[PDB]
């Protein structure tokens, strides 16, 4: 790999520089190189990995949705035929997005998840696995769509089981996992009631644990609680 000759610490340093410069493709490539050094990642390093790929795939998802909307309109009644170009270019972006998801899932499988023993790392990586299978599910249309959906569900469920056993209800990783699994239920699994129930129960349990927290921890937890509330307001 092109990062094989660079020191692990230099890759991390450059990932932080790329973030400051909003160069997220570079940031992702640097953190991929750091993961491939084979050492476990610290808390800060895990969040650099997540930030980088979340931004890259976020831009690809936004573009895919623009192009998919155009393609769907072109297939309505009374829409003039414009040839294969819209489909081709949507497919190009889709393939690039799938490739990024496959890359992340490959890093998790070789070998981040199997070496992750602490709840904070294991839940973080399993949430990531659920997230990137969810992104694959958003564009899936063929024979393997059900298996992609179930792979997302399975990863989220394992993360949830650990998080409920090992973390307090206000833990930001636990909260963000529940937020995203709730979105999975609503957007992917056609289960809006499950989505709503999960978001409400997560919010209420966290509310009841806020009294245990410092001011700084209270700020971190309430930030994600507000995202659960935003979704509940959208959905009810």
């Amino acid at each position: 790999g092109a990062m094989g000759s660079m020191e692990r610490a230099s890759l991390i340093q450059k990932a932080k520089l790329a973030e400051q410069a909003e160069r997220y493709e570079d940031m992702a490539a640097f953190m991929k190189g750091a993961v491939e050094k084979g050492e476990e990642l610290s808390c800060e390093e895990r969040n650099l990995l997540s930030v980088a790929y979340k931004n890259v795939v976020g831009g690809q998802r936004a573009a895919w949705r623009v192009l998919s909307s155009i393609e769907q309109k072109s297939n309505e009644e009374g829409s003039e035929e414009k040839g294969p170009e819209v489909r081709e270019y949507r497919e190009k972006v889709e393939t690039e997005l799938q490739g990024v998801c496959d890359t992340v899932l490959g890093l998790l499988d070789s070998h981040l998840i199997k070496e992750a023993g602490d709840a904070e790392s294991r839940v973080f990586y399993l949430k990531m696995k659920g997230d990137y299978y969810r992104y694959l599910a958003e564009v899936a249309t063929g024979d393997d769509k059900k298996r992609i959906i179930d792979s997302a569900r399975s990863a989220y469920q394992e993360a949830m089981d650990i998080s409920k056993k090992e973390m307090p209800p206000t833990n930001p990783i636990r909260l963000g996992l529940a937020l995203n699994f709730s979105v999975f239920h609503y957007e992917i699994a056609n289960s809006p009631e499950e989505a709503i129930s999960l978001a409400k129960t997560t919010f209420d349990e966290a509310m009841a644990d806020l009294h245990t927290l410092s001011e700084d921890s209270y700020k971190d937890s309430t930030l994600i609680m507000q995202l659960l509330r935003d979704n509940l307001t959208l959905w009810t």
Partner: peptide
């Protein structure tokens, strides 16, 4: 309109 994830 936007569904929130993190």
């Amino acid at each position: 309109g936007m569904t929130m994830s993190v």
